[PDB]
Amino acid sequence: WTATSGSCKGRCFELQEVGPPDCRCDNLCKSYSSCCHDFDELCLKTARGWECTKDRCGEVRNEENACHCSEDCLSRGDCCTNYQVVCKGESHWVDDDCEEIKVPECPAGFVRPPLIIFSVDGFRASYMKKGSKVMPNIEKLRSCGTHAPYMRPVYPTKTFPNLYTLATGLYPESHGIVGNSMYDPVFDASFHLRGREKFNHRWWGGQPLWITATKQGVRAGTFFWSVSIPHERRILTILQWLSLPDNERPSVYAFYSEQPDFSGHKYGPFGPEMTNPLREIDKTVGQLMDGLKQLRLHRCVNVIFVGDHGMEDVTCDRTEFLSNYLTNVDDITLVPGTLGRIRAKSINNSKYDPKTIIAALTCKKPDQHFKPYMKQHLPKRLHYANNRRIEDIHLLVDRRWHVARKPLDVYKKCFFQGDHGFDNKVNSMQTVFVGYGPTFKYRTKVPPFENIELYNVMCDLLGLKPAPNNGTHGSLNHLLRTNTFRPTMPDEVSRPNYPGIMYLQSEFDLGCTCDDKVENKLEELNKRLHTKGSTKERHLLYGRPAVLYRTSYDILYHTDFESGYSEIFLMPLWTSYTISKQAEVSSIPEHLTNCVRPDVRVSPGFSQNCLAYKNDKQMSYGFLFPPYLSSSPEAKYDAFLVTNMVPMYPAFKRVWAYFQRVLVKKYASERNGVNVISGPIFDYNYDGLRDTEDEIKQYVEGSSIPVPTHYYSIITSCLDFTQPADKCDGPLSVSSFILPHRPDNDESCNSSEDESKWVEELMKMHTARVRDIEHLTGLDFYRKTSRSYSEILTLKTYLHTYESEI
Ligand SMILES: *[C@@H]1O[C@H](CO)[C@@H](O[C@@H]2O[C@H](CO)[C@@H](O[C@@H]3O[C@H](CO[C@H]4O[C@H](CO[C@H]5O[C@H](CO)[C@@H](O)[C@H](O)[C@@H]5O)[C@@H](O)[C@H](O[C@H]5O[C@H](CO)[C@@H](O)[C@H](O)[C@@H]5O[C@H]5O[C@H](CO)[C@@H](O)[C@H](O)[C@@H]5O)[C@@H]4O)[C@@H](O)[C@H](O[C@H]4O[C@H](CO)[C@@H](O)[C@H](O)[C@@H]4O[C@H]4O[C@H](CO)[C@@H](O)[C@H](O)[C@@H]4O)[C@@H]3O)[C@H](O)[C@H]2NC(C)=O)[C@H](O)[C@H]1NC(C)=O
Ligand SMILES: CS(=O)(=O)c1cc(Cl)cc(COC(=O)N2CCC3(CC2)CN(C(=O)c2ccc4[nH]nnc4c2)C3)c1
Ligand SMILES: [Ca+2]
Ligand SMILES: [Ca+2]
Ligand SMILES: [Zn+2]
């Protein structure tokens, strides 16, 4: 109930909202039914259009036009954005040469350059290029400001998760908005786009930009709009807000466009109908820029132009139904679309068996267009698991296709030509980003960047301090003209031991068969120098990884590889090694095949044993420094130390082997050397953060040897590949992955063939940023380089997509 009898005489687009049932007149009163009776009248004016004709010039002010061309309009704040143009013979903004904005040029009373966040829905990355002809304003912004080729959204590439990520800098698994659709088990309730539930604040976590501004005494415009306010009125309202007396006037404002998403769903991404909704936007950007010029603000405001996701060609026929894969299709409940999520229809169903459901969905049709995962097994770069609103069963869907539950859910429950929500590394899903303003650079391209990073930029731009988020503060300094944030390397918490020889073979009892007992003054001295580290700047190019939590670990040196061995986890946390282009792969000689040797540097108490492995028919073992890539047949013995051993499933061993044996040399060739760091990853809680001892769930049977859930690798070389990895004195180049340590290869439908045909494909799928590994290992890389720390952060936010050209 609401008694909407109060008036809006004077509360037109008021900023603070009123507590029910006194009627409201803010830009959202519509969505809550509770507008003021005269709201429509007083605040949705429409007469004479949105543009000043040449006759309306210097008219007598009439209070119920939509905007005014009367001589007072400028200083009343309600001029039409083209008023100066027509009536006072001024040019449109777009018709101006871009001038470098060296210092911010603000009218007095403006403490700080205000921020305008202009968000356009579904604005695919390539619209900038393929549309430039019909978008002159948006092309000025881009070319004169600072843009990236494309901005990577987040999964799921849906509207709500992506808009609240921009405003929080948090993954959806963190803010809790994990789809446009969303059942919550604890709340017993569903969140849908149509309905009122979306308003309950209980779905929304983290601190959005607007709350962050306000908590710190920076006034914030309103960010959401009622869908019934026309865009031209939206811009007038913003320009109206800008005319407010200093202490009533917001510092950060927001525009939102339903286009081009709305059209794009109907015509596909480049339906020839699409040219026109694009023009609208550019027209609107024109109005906004024209209005800023009106107010002498146009060289003082920072505008951010940005999308939430792109659009892809998608149609009703390219739809897989599950009722073609299952039997009891009515015992589940599916969240369908460009991605499937599955759950029981009842938890009064204890006869629900998720293993069976997944099974019945794996490689079941030769050209299957989705793939089932349990949520913990999704690529870690998606960060889509650590929430109870995300169902344990997920269906990752092919670009261009849909998943639905039954045929009856599609014909009467075809029409459209485009959808969105696919894997976020897909090129059709990429969106846009330009920054124009005094605080941005002038005619400057920046590399692609994930959207999680904007919140930090926006706090910087507004003089705020960022609430804890998932971006990497400083990683986007290369965008800004001046930076509030001087980022700083985190201090090392744990210091390493550097253990010497302290044990004799006989003190060990690991049950470790080896054949190595045949063996000077020359190189009985050189090998000593290997275990001290005369080759330490050969295999550790960027300095020792920093351990950022409290533990006891050792630095073990060798001829070919350095490792940080954990006494607690009983394996290395990292192994680093250079493979120059001239490196050579070799075989594992017949006598040395089941060779596992005791490490006389580490206690038998802090070593693993071969016996637990023999007794475990589920577990085999593997090696971090590959034996295949030994420098000498003498150095090859080094790779067989029990301290280089890690546990591997036989199924995973296949993937691992091909990577070490084949791929490492491959890259080594292509990039003129690579430095490879590798190690385990323990994340049983799928939070994306390193597990500690007390949370280990799996052990190598009958031992204290914990089983990694993933294994990672960082592969770095010179960015200028004409320099050897181990002499690159310029920017770097990296690429990483985090493969799930799994006992089958059911993820890979080509598994039963040659590794040459499916491994490299599975690695590309599970690629990751160095930063992601950093969260998962609690480590910190690239400590000793010649490069700026800001440059290094950018490096670590990088994701290799293995996609084609945008
Ligand atoms: C990306 O970045 C984000 C953000 O930085 C990372 O997410 C953060 O990660 C932290 C580590 O997991 C986690 O810390 C938790 O916090 C627990 C509860 O904290 C609650 O209060 C928060 C208040 O916010 C304040 O914000 C500002 C300050 O900036 C203030 O001015 C305001 O006034 C506020 O007070 C609140 O944000 C948080 O909300 C969560 O829960 C809501 C619903 O209940 C959600 O709507 C909301 O979205 C949050 O939910 C997310 O996080 C939870 C995990 O906590 C996750 O399960 C959800 O799926 C979702 O993702 C809370 O309400 C706190 O209890 C924890 O401390 C326990 O564990 C530690 C471990 O040692 C103990 O030291 C401690 O004693 C304690 O143990 C106690 O509880 C145990 C079990 O209950 C028990 O056994 C033991 O005996 C003790 O009783 C812990 O510190 C943050 O919650 C989280 N923040 C966010 C935004 O999600 C994320 O990791 C990053 N991702 C990656 C991979 O990089
Ligand atoms: C970037 S920011 O400045 O930080 C920011 C952050 C947030 Cl959280 C919100 C905004 C402004 O948002 C609004 O004004 N809202 C109302 C209109 C809709 C979005 C929410 C369009 N919505 C659909 O319902 C829809 C659209 C496209 C779709 N494609 N497919 N389904 C769709 C559904 C509702 C700006
Ligand atoms: Ca959207
Ligand atoms: Ca964890
Ligand atoms: Zn859409």
UniProtKB/Swiss-Prot annotation:
Binds 2 Zn(2+) ions per subunit. Binds 1 Ca(2+) ion per subunit. Disulfide bonds join 8-25, 12-43, 23-36, 29-35, 52-69, 57-87, 67-80, 73-79, 98-144, 106-300, 316-414, 363-749, 512-610, 514-595, 718-728. It is found in: Secreted. Inhibited by vanadate. Inhibited by micromolar levels of bile salts, such as tauroursodeoxycholate. Not inhibited by taurodeoxycholate. Not inhibited by hydroxysterols, such as 7-hydroxycholesterol, testosterone, dexamethasone and prednisolone. Inhibited by EDTA and EGTA. Ca(2+) binds at residues 683, 685, 687, 689, 691. The active site is at residue 159. Gene3D superfamilies: 4.10.410.20, Alkaline Phosphatase, subunit A (3.40.720.10), Extracellular Endonuclease, subunit A (3.40.570.10). Its main location: secreted. This is Autotaxin. It comes from Rattus norvegicus.
